[PDB]
Amino acid sequence: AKTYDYLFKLLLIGDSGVGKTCVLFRFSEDAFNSTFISTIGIDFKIRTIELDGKRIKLQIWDTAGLERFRTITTAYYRGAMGIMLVYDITNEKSFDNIRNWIRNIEEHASADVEKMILGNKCDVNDKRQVSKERGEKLALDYGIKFMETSAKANINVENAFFTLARDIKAKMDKK
Amino acid sequence: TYDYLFKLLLIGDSGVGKTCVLFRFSEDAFNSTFISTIGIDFKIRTIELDGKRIKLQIWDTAGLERFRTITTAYYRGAMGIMLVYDITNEKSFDNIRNWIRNIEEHASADVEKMILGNKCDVNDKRQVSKERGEKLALDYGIKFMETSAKANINVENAFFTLARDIKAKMDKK
Amino acid sequence: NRPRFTLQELRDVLQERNKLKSQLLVVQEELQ
Amino acid sequence: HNRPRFTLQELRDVLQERNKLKSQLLVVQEEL
Ligand SMILES: Nc1nc2c(ncn2[C@@H]2O[C@H](COP(=O)(O)OP(=O)(O)OP(=O)(O)O)[C@@H](O)[C@H]2O)c(=O)[nH]1
Ligand SMILES: Nc1nc2c(ncn2[C@@H]2O[C@H](COP(=O)(O)OP(=O)(O)OP(=O)(O)O)[C@@H](O)[C@H]2O)c(=O)[nH]1
Ligand SMILES: [Mg+2]
Ligand SMILES: [Mg+2]
């Protein structure tokens, strides 16, 4: 009856407009819509994957980046088992703000939560403002895994979610 | 599957007991906690009349003014409307005339209407005698009942009577 | 505390909520 | 109107209800 062996709660955070909802739409529905519809508060989507012969249900919560929803969104940090911190490689402010999103994680998420930084929109390289090297170095400084992704071109979206789920599972299994 | 779908609406001031009246009808339960309705909600109950299965889609409106635009949208499709006041709150009774005007501005001219004077178990705070509710309803040519969601008085009777009156009108096709 | 969200913001969620309730009731009764 | 009208608690309650219904719906949908 239970359609899974593990259930992982994941969370997407980051500035408004960086592509969190599009990343989830690509992962959960394998599609891309360029029409921007800002997220009201929070939403979630589901996808089940297979790791080590186990069924892993991913319950993925998509937060609004806009400040007016901040209190609504931060209530969902405590239960998260893995958190994607998303910025937009064409928006330097969104990258600068990753440091503040990490602070928000430290303040409200579980101490041991798995984290990953995604530099999204890596298909738009002629409007790139954040070098891949700078993204890698920031992630290195915080000891967090890093990937550049594109919801539009479908680059590293499955890789990001599969990798985060494998890191959650390995920690669970070893304990 | 059903024979007919009757869209009903509950309107009236905040706190008069619209949601508890619906809770009694749909769940046969009552709770004293006040959880004010945010905009609108609905419940479904299917009943049997004259060998026809009637699906009642019952929309439960918020009474506070800040939800007025949200709630009035639902008048247009209503086939029956309960106008609810609180027998312990004369202000809610006086506002029935304003709710009637709201029906006249947004619902069909022939919509079935019924007035409920709710909380009739709280006689130690009563502010509106039963006769005043009866006279108000008579003047508009509509039916009246005193109800109590808490004591289970006239809630089933009110909804079945409203549904039967809608069905009788409709059967005159 | 203070009013913060617009009519359209609340309406959008209310209408999504209503739609899911209707869809839920339908699949529920379809288990006859 | 861009006019603020509804509180944190009001929007949050309806969001919570919407999300809980979405879960209930997904559950009964896969019972098929
Ligand atoms: N070129 C390109 N555009 C993208 C990509 N991902 C998202 N976008 C565009 O960026 C805009 C913002 O995307 P969203 O997913 O809605 O952003 P969000 O982070 O969910 O924003 P909030 O919900 O307001 O926090 C959308 O119009 C997308 O079309 C991408 O990978 N490549
Ligand atoms: N004693 C008594 N209390 C009642 C009765 N009906 C409702 N109440 C109480 O009155 C309060 C208001 O009831 P609600 O049904 O939530 O009021 P409402 O009309 O839906 O109010 P809004 O949603 O704000 O428009 C609650 O505390 C109920 O428990 C009743 O028949 N008798
Ligand atoms: Mg979004
Ligand atoms: Mg109510």
Specify the DSSP class assigned to residue B123: G
Partners of C11 on chain B (C-beta within 8 Å) are: 39, 70
Smallest-distance ligand from the CA of B35 = 2
Q: Where are the beta strands (DSSP E) in chain A?
A: 6-13, 42-51, 54-63, 82-88, 114-120, 145-148
A19 known member of a binding site:
yes
> What 3-state class would DSSP assign to A43?
strand
B14 known member of a binding site:
yes
Mutate to test the interface with C, among D3, D6, D7, D10 (most CBs of C within 10 A): D6
Say yes or no for a CB contact (<8 Å) between D5 and C2. no
Torsional class of A109: left (φ above 0), alpha (ψ -120 to 50), beta (otherwise): beta
Looking at the complex, does the CB of residue C25 fall below 8 Å from at least one CB of chain B?
Answer: yes
- How many alpha carbons fall within 13 Å on the CB side of residue A95? 22
Contact of chains B and A by CB distance (3 or more pairs under 8 angstroms): no
> What 3-state class would DSSP assign to B75?
coil
Smallest-distance ligand from the CA of B67 = 2
A120 known member of a binding site:
yes
Superfamily of domain B1-173: P-loop containing nucleotide triphosphate hydrolases (3.40.50.300)
Positions of chain breaks in chain A, given as the residue before each break (C to N > 2.5 Å): none
Nearest-atom number in ligand 1 for the CA of A151 is 31
Distance B116 CA to ligand 2 centre (A): 13
The arrangement of secondary structure in A1-175, i.e. its CATH architecture, is 3-Layer(aba) Sandwich (3.40)
Give the H/E segment covering residue B68.
helix B68-72
Distance between D30 CA and the closest CA of chain C, angstroms: 10
Contact of chains B and C by CB distance (3 or more pairs under 8 angstroms): yes
Token output for B127:
């502010």
Gap between the Cα atoms of A124 and A130, Å rounded: 11
Q: Where are the domains of chain A?
A: 1-175
Looking at the complex, does the CB of residue D3 fall below 8 Å from at least one CB of chain B?
Answer: no
**How crowded is residue A33: how many other Cβ atoms within 10 Å of its Cβ?**
13
Give the H/E segment covering residue B7.
strand B4-11
- DSSP string over A109-154: S-TT-EEEEEEE-TT-GGG--S-HHHHHHHHHHHT-EEEE-BTTTT
Gap between the Cα atoms of A62 and A76, Å rounded: 10
- How far is the CA of A130 from the CAs of A52, A121, A140, B60, B70, in angstroms? 36, 11, 15, 52, 45
**How crowded is residue C16: how many other Cβ atoms within 10 Å of its Cβ?**
19
Cα dihedral B101, B105, B108, B112 in deg (nearest 10)? -10
